[PDB]
């Protein structure tokens, strides 16, 4: 009926994944997408293996999916606890939007993050104050968390 979208997009972004965002395996639940993202070449973010557990509700293609990063990555817009909020997913959104667009939004946020702080401002404040201050730790953290 409508659940097929979860598996369809899962396999879709598994065989031929878009830019940086890749899918494949699932989490503890079918509505718990365990996607993996890769860092860009311009910003201090490497590929490695960063998991992002996206939780879809009973209205996945109608209600904004709750994205919760599994792998703690040092990103000004990605809190250490996994708090990652998408700009286009803020204040509702247009009913049915492919996960590809949602994931691509994170990719665009990887190339030079946003100074707008989310849950914990620390990561955004350091970026807003000085780039190098966050650049040095970003590339270090992404490496130490690259298993």
């Amino acid at each position: 009926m409508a659940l097929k979208r979860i598996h369809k997009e899962l396999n879709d972004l598994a065989r031929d994944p878009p830019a940086q965002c890749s899918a494949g395996p699932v989490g503890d639940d079918m509505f718990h997408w365990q996607a993996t993202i890769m860092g860009p070449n311009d910003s201090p973010y490497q590929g490695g293996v960063f998991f992002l557990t996206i939780h879809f509700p009973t209205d996945y293609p109608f209600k904004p999916p709750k994205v919760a990063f599994t792998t703690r990555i040092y990103h000004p817009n990605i809190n250490s606890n996994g708090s990652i909020c998408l700009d286009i997913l803020r204040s509702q959104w247009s009913p049915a939007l492919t996960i590809s667009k949602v994931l691509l939004s994170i990719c665009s946020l990887l190339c030079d993050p946003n100074p707008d702080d989310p849950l914990v401002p620390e990561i955004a404040r350091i970026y807003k104050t000085d780039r190098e201050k966050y650049n040095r730790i970003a590339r270090e953290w992404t490496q130490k968390y690259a298993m």
């Binding site: 997009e9 209205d59 109608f62 209600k63 247009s94 009913p95 049915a96």
Partner: protein, 52 residues
């Protein structure tokens, strides 16, 4: 043909069934859902559907 609303197939007579003239066609078993939990908006416009 599969509606991007649920990644599920469509009907022959559903191909001409579009609640919006923005080229966005979707099977009846998809549009009805938008009018159930959502405000009945266009998945690529955020605007309310002219459909009943």
């Amino acid at each position: 043909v599969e509606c991007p609303l649920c990644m599920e197939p469509l009907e022959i007579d559903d191909i001409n069934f579009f609640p919006c003239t923005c080229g966005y066609q979707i099977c009846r078993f998809c549009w009805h859902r938008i009018r159930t939990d959502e405000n009945g908006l266009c998945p690529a416009c955020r605007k309310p559907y002219p459909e009943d």
